[PDB]
Design a protein around this ligand. Sequence first.
Ligand SMILES: COCC(CCO[C@H]1CC[C@@]2(C)C(=CC[C@H]3[C@@H]4C[C@@H]5O[C@]6(CC[C@@H](C)CO6)[C@@H](C)[C@@H]5[C@@]4(C)CC[C@@H]32)C1)COC
Length: 1116
Amino acid sequence: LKNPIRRACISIVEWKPFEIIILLTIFANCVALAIYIPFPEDDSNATNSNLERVEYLFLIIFTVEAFLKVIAYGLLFHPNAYLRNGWNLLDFIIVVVGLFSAIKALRAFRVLRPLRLVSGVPSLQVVLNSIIKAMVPLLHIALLVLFVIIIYAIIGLELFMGKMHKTCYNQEGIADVPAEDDPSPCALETGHGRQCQNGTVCKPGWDGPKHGITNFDNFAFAMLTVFQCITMEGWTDVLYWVNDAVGRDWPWIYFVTLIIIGSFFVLNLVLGVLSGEFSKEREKAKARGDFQKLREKQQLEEDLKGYLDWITQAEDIDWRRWNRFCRRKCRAAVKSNVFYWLVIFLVFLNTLTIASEHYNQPNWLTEVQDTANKALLALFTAEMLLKMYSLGLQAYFVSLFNRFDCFVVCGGILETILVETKIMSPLGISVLRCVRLLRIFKITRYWNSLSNLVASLLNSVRSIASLLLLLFLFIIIFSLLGMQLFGGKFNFDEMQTRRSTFDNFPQSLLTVFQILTGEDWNSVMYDGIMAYGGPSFPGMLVCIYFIILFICGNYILLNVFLAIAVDNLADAELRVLRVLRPLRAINRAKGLKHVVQCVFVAIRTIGNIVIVTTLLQFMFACIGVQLFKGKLDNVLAAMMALFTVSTFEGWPELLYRSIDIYNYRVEISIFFIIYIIIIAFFMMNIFVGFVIVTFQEQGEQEYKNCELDKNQRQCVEYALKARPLRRYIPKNQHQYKVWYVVNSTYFEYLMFVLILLNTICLAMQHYGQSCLFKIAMNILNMLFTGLFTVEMILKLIAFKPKHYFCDAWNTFDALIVVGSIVDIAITRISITFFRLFRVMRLVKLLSRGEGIRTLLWTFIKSFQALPYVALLIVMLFFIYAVIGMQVFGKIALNDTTEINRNNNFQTFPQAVLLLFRCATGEAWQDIMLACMPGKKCAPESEPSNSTEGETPCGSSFAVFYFISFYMLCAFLIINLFVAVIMDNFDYLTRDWSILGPHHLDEFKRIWAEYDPEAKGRIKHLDVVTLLRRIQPPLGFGKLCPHRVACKRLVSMNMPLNSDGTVMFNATLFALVRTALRIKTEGNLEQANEELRAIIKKIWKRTSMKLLDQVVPPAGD
Ligand SMILES: COCC(CCO[C@H]1CC[C@@]2(C)C(=CC[C@H]3[C@@H]4C[C@@H]5O[C@]6(CC[C@@H](C)CO6)[C@@H](C)[C@@H]5[C@@]4(C)CC[C@@H]32)C1)COC
C-alpha cells in the first residue's frame, strides 16, 4: 500500500497499443516455437542457436510486463486466474532458464505460452468462461462413467485373467499364422484355435495385441482396453479375439451390455448439455428481447420500403411530361404477375441451357452454346434499368438482397467481356455458371422455406467464428505439445511408411486432427507408447496424453455441436410375410403416427434439398473435371458414389489412403468437406426442421393452462396432494443408536476403503500369478468375508428383524448378504458373482449420490413412452433379420476374408450380432462390400460346379436396404431421445437453479423426515423446539420460528387446535401462501375462490374432503 507517485504513474500505462504490442510479442513467440526444427540430441545448426537467444528477449519483455502489473496492482494481480497462470508460466520459464545457464524437460512449459493469448483478447474470455461454466453442473455425471469404467473391467479380470497367454508359435517364436490371425489356444474342448496348419505347436506367449498392450492382464491394460471399447471403435476386433480365444456365444452379453450402457450415458450427457444450454437460451435472453429487436428492425425496413413506394407513387402521379407519362406505365408494368412469371420462366430456361453441358466435348453445338450466353446478359439487364427507372435510385439499390443481384450481374457481364478476349487461367465459364446458380436464388426468393435457412446460415457464422477460432487454437497447442513430446522419435525399429508422424508441423497437425476424429487413433497411440515407453510402470505416461486429447477435444467438438445446437438455437430463433399383428397392436399410443405423417409430408422438401445439393455437386464436378482430373463415374453421380463410402466414416479413410493424381487438385477433398459441411448444416437444418417438426410433434402439446398461474399452479397441484406419513421406529434404542452413530459416514467410508483395498487385492491381482501373492490374497479374502459377516450380523439383529425386511435399501443389502452367504458356502467360474457382489458394493456408492440418483429415478423409471419405440425397434429388427436369412443364405464363411466363423450369418443369434454391429456404424462399409454379385457363396450345392462361370450369389441389393435400416434406426433413436428429454423437461430444465418446485418436493420429504416424533398434532411450543428450521430457500429467513412473526401468525392464524396443534397439510398450505400471495383474514375473494374452485377448476378434490375439515381451522 503505497501510492504517492509510482503507483499512480504506473497504472496509467494501460494503452490499447500496449496490449497490441504484447499480443504481437505473443504471436511472434508462437511463430518462433512453430518451426523449431527438431533434432535427435543437441544439433546446433545456427538455427536453434539463435532461437536460444531469442528466448532471452521474450523472457525479459514478459518479466518487465509482469513487474509493471505487480507494481500497478499489488495484492490483486494474484487472485485473477489468468494473471496467476501467466505469472506461473513466467516463473517456470525464468527458473528453467536460470537452471540451464547455471550448468531440458521444463522447455515444454514454453508450449503453454499461446494460451496466454486468450487471457487478454475480448470476445474470447466470455466464451471460454461460458464453456467452462456449462460443464460444471454436469461434472457429477462424468463421475458415474468412472464407476462403469471400473465395474465391467473388474468382470473381465474375473473371466479373462491370462486367457491370451497360450499361443500357437509354429516352431520357435513364430506363430503359424500370417501375422494376422489370433493364435487361439489348442483347447482341450476343440472348436476354437484348432490350428490345423499341418504341424502346429501351441505354447504360452504374447500373440494377442500388436504390441502386447491391450492384453487383459496388467489391470491398467484392462482399463485401457475397456476405455477403447467404450468409445465405439474397434470393439468388434477384441470381441472376435476373445471369442476365438475362449469360445463362441459365451461372452458377447458382456460387450453388448457395455455398449448399451455407453449409449445410455451418451444420451444422459446430451440431455445434461441440453439443460445447460436451455438455462441461458431463454433466461437472460427474453429479458433484453434481442429477437424482438431484430423483428423491429425488419419491420422498420418493410415499413420504410412501403412508405418510399408510396412517396414514389405520389410524385409519379403528377421533354419531361412524356417522360413522366412513360414513368407510370413502366412502374405499373413491372408489377404485373404475368411479367414475373415470364421472367422466371426465361431465367429457368437459360439456367437449364447453361447447365445443358453433360461433360461432353463436342464442337458443333458448343459454338451454339457460346453466343446465346451473351444474349442472356440482355435478358439479365432489362429488368435492372427498369428497377432503376420504375423504382427510386436510392430505394431499389438499398435492400441487401437486390444489391447483391446487381453486383452479381455486373460481375457476370464484366467476366463475359473479359473472356471475350484471351486470359490466362480464365475461370470465366466457371463463375458465369456459378452466378447462373445464383439465379435460382430468385427462385429462393419465392418459397421462403430455403431463404430463411440461408439467412440463418449467414447469421450463425458471426457467432460461430469465436468457437472455431478457439478450436483452431486448441488444436494448435495440442499439436505443438505432440511435436515437442516426440519430435521424430517414431523410429519403431521398422521400415514401413507410417501413415502419421510428429516430425513437421503440418503432418503433426493433420495427425492431431485425425486422432480427434477418432479414426485409427488406437494404433497411433500404441505406436507412440512403443516408441520410447515400452509396457511398464513408467511407460504409460505417454498414453494419458492421448486420452485427454480425445475427451477435452471431442467434448469441445460436441460443445461445437452444442454450438451447432446454439446454431440450431440460432436456427430456432415373399416367404413368411405373416407379421401383420404388431401393426394392429401398436395402434394404441397414437404418439408416433403424427410423427410418421409429418416425416412423410416433409420428405418432399427433404428431396428438394437433396436435388439442389446434387445440382451444386454437378456444377462443382463439371468445373473440376473440365479444369483438372484429366485422364491420361458421372458429373452428377460420381460424388454420390464416393459419398456411399464417405458418410463421415470413410472420408478419413480417403485421406489415410491419399496421404501416400497425388497432389493434383486435392481441393476436391476440401470440397468433400464443404459439401458434407453443407449437408452437416442443411441436413442439420432439415434436422432443425425436424426440430421444428418435433416442436410441432411434442412442443405444441402445451395446450391451455386453465389454472391460476403457470408455475404456482404446479406448486398448488403438487402441495395439495401431499399427505403425511408415520415412519414407525421400533423400541430398540441402544442398537438403533449404534445404527445412527457407527452405521453412518464413518461406516460407509470404512466400507468404501475396505472394498477399495479388496479391489487392490483382486482388481490389482498380480500379472500371471505368484504363490506368495496367491496365499496373501486368499487370506485377505478370508478376512474380508469375516468382516462382511460381522457387519451383516450387526446390521441384521440390531435392525429389529421385524423391521429388517421393510426398507427398500434394507432389502438391497439383504440381497447383498444372501450373495455373501452364498460366497461363504461355496468358497468357480460362472458362479463367482459374489466377488461381483463386492463390485456391486461399488454401486452402493451411487446411493450416496442421492442428489444424482434422482436423475436415475427419472431415466430408468421413464419407461412410459419407451415401450412403444422399443417395440417398434425390436419389430424392425425382427423384420430386417428374418428377411436376410433366405436372401443371404450360405454366407460362405472363410478364414481371413471379412466373412468368417465369427462373421457367420446363417445362425440367427450371430445374424442379430452382425446386424447390430452394422447398426452402430462400426465399419459397415466393409460389410456392404462383402456381398458382391461375382462372389461365390458356399459352392457345395449340386448346381454349383461353375460350368458357366457364374456365382449363384447376387446379394447386390443389401446396400440400399442397410442404408434404409441405418436411417430408420437413427431416426427412431432420435425419437426416443426426444421422448426422454420431453419427459425430463419438467424435471431437468426446470427452476432447479434456486427455487425449483422439485426442491419444494424434497423439502416436503424432509418434512416427512425432519419430524421424528410423528405425533400428528405437534404443539406450538413443540414446533419451536424442532420445526423451527422450516426451509432456507422458501422461508423468509433464519429468524425461527417465524421471521415475519406478525404476518406468519396473523395472515396464517396461530394454530391452536390443541395446545398449538399444527397440521402437516396446514403447514404446507401456509408455505404455499408464503410462495403465493393471499392476505390475512378478510381475504374471502382470492382465498375463497382458491378453496372453492377446488371442486370445479383449480384442483379436483370433490372426494377426500378432509381438507375442508382441517383448513377451516386455518384457512376456510
Ligand atoms: C418447456 O420447454 C420447451 C419449450 C418449447 C420449445 O421446445 C424447445 C425445447 C428443446 C428442443 C426440443 C428444441 C429445439 C432444439 C432441440 C435440440 C436439437 C439437437 O438435436 C440433437 C439430436 C442428436 C444429434 C444428432 C444432434 O443434437 C439434440 C442433442 C438436440 C435437441 C433435440 C435437444 C432438445 C431441443 C425446442 C421452450 O423451450 C425453448
